[PDB]
Design a protein that fits this description.
part of a larger assembly; 2 chains; A: about 400 residues; mainly alpha; two-stranded antiparallel sheet; 16 helices; about 60% helix; B: about 350 residues; alpha+beta; 13 helices; 4 strands; about 70% helix; about 5% strand; flat; Dynein gamma chain, flagellar outer arm (chain A); motor protein; dynein; microtubule; cilia
Chain lengths: ~400, ~350
């Protein structure tokens, strides 16, 4: 409830961090003391953030600074390139003077570098154990929190992805040729992604995400701006090429955005089969065809080829791995896997029946070779296990070397 | 040199721990400053915790539940502390508060929506990614709001997206919310009334009408889910108002028959399962009771049991005057009765 005591506590802490000892730190926290009272005790402000910019040394020395720059003891703690913050958001509904200031007001000390590193550090990296320790310390609310921190991880992924006259004629040639060639390159990303490998369908989503990130980077890079103004001056060599590339870039960007958001809708029902159990995919497949069937009521060859070949690649990967880690277990797993392939083909043929009703090369090749190399081996093990009941009646006087014939046949 | 980093971290620790003493030598002189120097001189080392228990210090990672603790986090952005370029501007110099979940809620709703707003205003993300970061920061807000407390007790389209996504999630939370029996139904009445005026309050009403400037599909679904809320709420209230050495306390069992007399003059399955609860109390008492006295105490034990089954047939005859439950009471209580007939004989 005491404005001045917490004012001088934040003066001392912002001096110990910043180096502005007494004069303008205390003057700026003193100035407009109605709001300084109206954050601490009263309603309205839930923090009073002193941000301090710099204009001469780019704040690199950090030991101390003049106040020629404009510091803002403003309500918002903004994230620009230039000002180091202190928020002192208070963890008390009413400002109580008796409670100390450094046990509820967290300091706002911020690296002068931009929005990549500090925020992912403060969200994902630093806070790893306490919730987990609180996971250890008695909660039922364990569910959906692990994937909540996987959402923090994908924040980290996307911020790492995204944040990372003769003289005039010379400048025009110097900044055009390079960037036009790069744009022409980036309009060929659909071609270097058709290759021979058992690849997984999430790499599709990641390829489209890289297309998004590079499109955003180039379109921001063009929006250096003096060279655009130089282009406007120099229309009276690349400007035919620039309007052509602009039309190409707009069409590519629009189809990329539509593809990314619709391919993003698919993820929560294709997700169980990447790492789960072999029988789970059987139940997942009706949901999977509800998703795919609704999405081809909208938008073709690239979707069909990449989606179906890679998803069937992943089914082969999961079945073959989950079998490889004896007899009754193996025969059971082969029965389960053949039933999985059978229900997949059955539901795709039902899908083709519906697709014909209302208004498959990869499947053929991949599951036909898998199912034939499973029928042969499942019949071999059924025969072996049917001959395996012989294996312990060793005292009958006519089953001694007979089993060694069976042993050679096995071996 | 390591000395500029050492004295910088020392002056920061004297700033943030605020205990004037030579205690820096009393704790750090063991594993402390060696762990600090190996933290600063090794690759991949990205975190450090120091806890201030009022006056005491601990350089660690594991947070204890001791009150008045304070948290400071140290991270070198670089793998060493460089002699050439200054280390005073350390990328992570964090001081925090005792309770973590309150701070995460406060940081979500106070200090880091500027990261959502102003970098969106400046370069980098004018695309669908701005809509994405707004929506899942709203998800952050909703989650940190609900998982605390509930455990313990062109513009038009995107604004519609936010103000419909938060109710998709909150309805998932609501449908999750639809003496074990007594406390179960008391909790159900209390929680469902509390959510029922979490849904009929002012700002929710304005949100429903602002959304009803679109009138597309979702709002009949929230109408039907409110229909789910209200009847269960009132009926839970009704049965909560209804529900409000054993040799000395057989007359209490008359009270029990009278409760069944008075209540049923609800639904049958919970009635039979309440009888199961009564029988598990009776087995609790009949283990609480325990070579010639043993027959006497087991005679008393069967005597209480036959008053119990006699009150059952009294309730049956008075029901006739004013079928599976017999089999159920037989199952539980007769399993017990033959356990101790065997031991008594």
């Amino acid at each position: 409830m005491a404005l001045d005591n917490r004012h001088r506590l934040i003066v001392g802490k912002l001096a110990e961090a910043f180096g502005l000892p007494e004069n303008v730190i205390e003057k700026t926290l003193t100035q407009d003391k109605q709001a300084v009272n109206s954050f601490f005790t009263p309603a309205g402000p839930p923090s009073l953030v002193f941000v301090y910019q710099v204009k001469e040394d780019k704040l690199k020395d950090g030991s101390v600074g003049p106040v020629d720059n404009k510091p803002t003891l403003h309500r918002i703690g903004p994230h620009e390139r230039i000002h180091n913050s202190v928020y002192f958001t208070r963890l008390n509904p009413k400002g109580i003077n008796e409670k100390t200031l450094e046990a509820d007001m967290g300091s706002g000390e911020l690296s002068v570098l931009w929005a990549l590193e500090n925020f992912k550090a403060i969200v994902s990296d630093l806070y790893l154990p306490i919730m987990q320790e609180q996971q250890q310390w008695g909660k039922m609310s364990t569910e959906y929190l692990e994937d909540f921190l996987s959402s923090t991880a994908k924040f980290g992924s996307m911020l790492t992805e995204a944040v990372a006259d003769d003289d005039t004629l010379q400048e025009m040639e110097e900044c055009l040729t390079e960037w036009c060639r790069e744009a022409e390159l980036l309009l060929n990303q659909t071609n270097k992604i058709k290759d021979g490998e058992e690849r997984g369908p999430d790499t599709e989503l990641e390829y489209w995400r890289t297309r998004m990130s590079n499109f955003n980077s180039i379109t921001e890079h063009l929006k250096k701006e003096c060279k655009l103004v130089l282009g406007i001056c120099s229309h009276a060599k690349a400007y035919l090429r620039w309007r052509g590339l602009d039309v190409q870039i707009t069409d590519a960007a629009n189809e990329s955005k539509d593809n990314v958001k619709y391919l993003a809708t698919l993820e929560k029902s294709m997700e169980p089969m990447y790492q789960g159990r072999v029988t789970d995919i059987t139940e997942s497949l009706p949901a999977l065809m509800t998703n795919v069937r609704m999405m081809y009521t909208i938008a073709t060859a690239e979707h069909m080829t990449r989606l179906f070949t890679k998803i069937t690649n992943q089914l082969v990967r999961r079945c073959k791995e989950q079998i490889m880690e004896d007899k009754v277990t193996l025969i059971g797993n082969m029965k389960v896997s053949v039933e999985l392939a059978n229900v997949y083909r059955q539901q795709y043929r039902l899908a083709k029946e519906t697709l014909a009703a209302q208004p498959e090369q990869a499947i053929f090749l991949k599951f036909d070779l898998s199912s034939k190399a499973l029928h042969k081996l499942i019949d071999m093990f059924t025969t072996i296990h049917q001959f395996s009941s012989l294996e312990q009646h060793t005292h009958i006087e006519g089953l001694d070397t007979m089993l060694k014939s069976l042993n050679n046949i096995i071996d | 040199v390591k000395d500029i980093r050492f004295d910088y971290i020392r002056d920061r620790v004297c700033s943030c721990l605020k205990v004037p003493d030579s205690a820096y030598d009393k704790l750090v002189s063991g594993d402390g400053r060696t762990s600090l120097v190996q933290f600063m001189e090794e690759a991949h080392t990205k975190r450090l915790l120091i806890m201030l228990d009022g006056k005491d210090l601990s350089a660690t990672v594991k947070p204890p539940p001791k009150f008045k603790k304070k948290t400071v986090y140290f991270l070198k952005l670089q793998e060493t502390k460089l002699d050439n370029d200054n280390i005073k501007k350390l990328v992570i110099h964090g001081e925090i508060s005792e309770n973590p979940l309150e701070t995460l809620a406060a940081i979500s709703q106070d200090v880091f929506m500027p990261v959502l707003t102003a970098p969106a205003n400046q370069q980098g993300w004018p695309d669908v990614v701005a809509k994405e970061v707004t929506e899942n920061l709203h998800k952050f807000v909703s989650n940190v709001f609900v998982t605390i407390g509930q455990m313990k007790g062109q513009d038009k389209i995107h604004i519609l997206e936010s103000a419909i996504v938060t109710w998709t999630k909150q309805i998932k939370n609501v449908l999750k919310a639809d003496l074990t029996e007594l406390n179960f139904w008391s909790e159900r009445a209390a929680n469902l009334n509390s959510i029922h005026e979490q849904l009929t309050s002012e700002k929710t009403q304005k949100v429903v009408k602002v959304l009803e400037l679109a009138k597309s599909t979702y709002y009949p679904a929230f109408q039907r889910l409110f229909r789910e809320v209200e009847a269960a709420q009132q009926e839970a209230n009704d049965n909560v108002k209804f529900l409000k050495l054993v040799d000395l306390f057989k007359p209490i069992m008359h009270t029990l028959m009278l409760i069944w007399k008075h209540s049923k003059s609800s639904s049958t399955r919970f009635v039979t399962l309440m009888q199961e609860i009564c029988n598990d109390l009776i087995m609790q008492a009949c283990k609480y009771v325990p070579s010639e006295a043993v027959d006497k105490l087991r005679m008393t034990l069967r005597v209480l049991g036959t008053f119990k089954n006699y009150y059952f047939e009294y309730r049956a005859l008075s029901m006739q005057d004013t079928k599976f439950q017999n089999n159920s009471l037989f199952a539980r209580l007769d399993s017990f009765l033959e356990r101790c007939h065997d031991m008594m004989d």
